[PDB]
């Protein structure tokens, strides 16, 4: 209908990438739908994020899957995403017909800060291929990464959701989905958290397969591993 | 002339705000001027920044002044900057003729992460006025801060250099220079670092009053305090 009168607060701890490219539409929709809920969002490192909902006052952790770190939280898979290579049109990569990771490792890289927004998968891929990449520029934000790629500092590696040809018309995007293993964005919370109906609403808005029932089943499992296995038959959203 | 053949590396540890709004022009100019220097830049927290040049491999720390943290580095003042209030045109602040900090504290705030990019001065100002601000949104990036201000999450407080009416035409900027004490961006390095001529070039490009002589005098002082006092007669750049 119109709006809910529900009343309460919703504290989110998340990353730049989620805050910037994944959440604004969800949050806009939620804000008009749930007028009397005080929404809070604090960008943090994956460590800070886990700490914030684990020890602090965040209700929800929204971040890409990071080891046994969200271990004592209820973690739910929301969507899969991967990386795009960003270069200038005059870059040797732009000419190259199919670009591999040995071709990519030839160049200085401009990408995410270590342990952020799935850097691990980039590192792991290089380790696996026995290659040592020259990472010269590092940041939390795809925007400045793009800025420095356009100055010729090197080859950008960002999240594909952080690119758009409409808003970055002077760049060349190369999909690296066959180059890196995909990353999974997860939503998480403390088990002791009483899940308000707006909390269910929000979760399902951000992750449609996560209906109230499914969420309730997941908390009943008491393993994040079993929770992820719940969905191994279905194709999760790709972003 | 054209270019220098000089050869070496330049490792910079800095913040988002510097990387995004203060450095790209300097770096572009430096990159064509100093072709054979490998430039590296890694965004980090003020803690990471200090650690990186203090313990790690960064040559230069570029960040706003942060206590006895850069204590065992050579710190040089580069420029002063302050904050702007960012709201939507239909915000009560936009109508208000002169906006004070008691008027501002009436509203939920969208600003920098704690201990970042001069948050302290915002906090200190609120403490001094005996006011407790409702900070609902926090981030390292002015861009997403602006994004969430436009959704009506609250009142933005960013660096003035992070705003432009040309590139953010649908926002209202209010200068808060009489509201917050200014912040000072500083450049810093380890004393044992041999200062290459490109390093002097770069420093002076970023901070014109910091000529080779002046820089050399500053290292001779062996106090960051005396170094800052060297310039107390002149007006530092304002950004």
Task: Provide the CATH number for the domain around residue B122.
Answer: 3.40.190.10
Residue whose token pair is 């900027």: B173
Rounded alpha-carbon distances, angstroms, from residue A54 to A38, A57, B65: 20, 8, 31
On whether both B176 and B198 belong to a single domain, the answer is: no
CA distance B157 to B115: 14
If you measure CA to CA, which chain A residue comes closest to B19? A144
> Which H or E run includes A14?
strand A8-14
A179 CA: distance to closest CA in chain B (Å): 24
Query: Are B41 and A152 within 8 A, CB to CB?
Result: no
> Burial code of B92-101, b = ≥16 C-beta within 10 A, e = fewer?
ebeeeeebeb
Query: Are B27 and A148 within 8 A, CB to CB?
Result: yes
On whether both A115 and A134 belong to a single domain, the answer is: yes
Q: Which residues pair with B138 in a beta bridge?
A: A42, B111
**Within a 10 A sphere around the Cβ of B145, how many other Cβ atoms?**
27
Q: What's the number of domains chain A is made of?
A: 2
> Burial code of A10-33, b = ≥16 C-beta within 10 A, e = fewer?
bbbbbbbbbbbbbbbeebbebbeb
Domain encompassing residue B153? 82-182
Q: B183-189 and B74-81: which strand pairing?
A: antiparallel
On whether both A173 and A87 belong to a single domain, the answer is: yes
With 0-12 / 13-18 / 19 or more C-beta atoms within 10 angstroms meaning exposed / middle / buried, residue B16 is buried
Residues of A in contact with B24 (CB under 8 A): 147-148, 151
> Which H or E run includes B187?
strand B183-189
Characterise B222 by phi-psi region: left (phi > 0), alpha (psi -120 to 50), beta (else): left
Last-in-domain residue among A145, A163, A182: A182
Reduce the DSSP state of residue A166 to 3 states and report it. coil
On whether both A177 and A194 belong to a single domain, the answer is: no
Q: Resolution of the experimental model in angstroms, please?
A: 2.2
**Within a 10 A sphere around the Cβ of B173, how many other Cβ atoms?**
17
The residue ranges of DSSP E strands in B28-105, in sequence order, are 37-43, 60-64, 74-81, 83-87
On whether both B70 and B119 belong to a single domain, the answer is: no
**Residue in B42, B44, B138 nearest the CB of A43:** B138
CA distance B117 to A78: 32
Local structure of residue A234 (DSSP, 8 states): S
Q: Name, in order, each residue with C-beta under 8 angstroms of B117's C-beta and a sequence gap of 6 or more.
A: B15, B16, B17, B64, B140, B159, B183
């Amino acid at each position: 209908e119109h709006t809910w009168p529900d009343k309460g607060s919703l504290y989110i701890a998340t990353t730049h990438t989620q805050a910037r490219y994944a959440l604004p539409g969800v949050i806009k929709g939620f804000i008009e739908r749930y007028p009397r809920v005080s929404l809070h969002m604090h960008q943090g490192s994956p460590t800070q994020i886990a700490e914030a909902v684990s020890k602090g006052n965040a209700d929800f952790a929204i971040a890409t899957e990071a080891l046994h770190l969200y271990d004592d939280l209820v973690m739910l898979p929301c969507y899969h995403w991967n990386r795009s290579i960003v270069v200038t049109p005059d870059h040797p990569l732009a000419a190259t017909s199919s670009v591999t990771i040995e071709a990519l490792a030839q160049y200085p890289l401009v990408t995410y800060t270590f342990g952020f927004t799935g850097r691990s998968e980039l590192d792991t891929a290089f380790n696996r291929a026995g290659l040592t990449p020259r990472i010269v520029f590092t940041a939390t934000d795809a925007d400045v990464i793009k800025t420095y790629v356009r100055l010729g500092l090197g080859v950008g590696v960002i999240a594909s959701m952080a690119v758009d040809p409409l808003a970055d018309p002077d760049l060349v995007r190369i999909d690296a989905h066959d180059i890196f293993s995909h990353s999974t964005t997860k939503i998480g919370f403390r088990r002791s958290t009483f899940l308000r109906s707006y909390m269910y609403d929000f979760i399902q808005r951000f992750a449609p397969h996560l209906t109230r029932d499914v969420v309730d089943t997941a908390v009943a499992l008491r393993s994040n591993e079993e929770i992820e296995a719940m969905f191994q038959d279905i194709k999760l959203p790709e972003k």
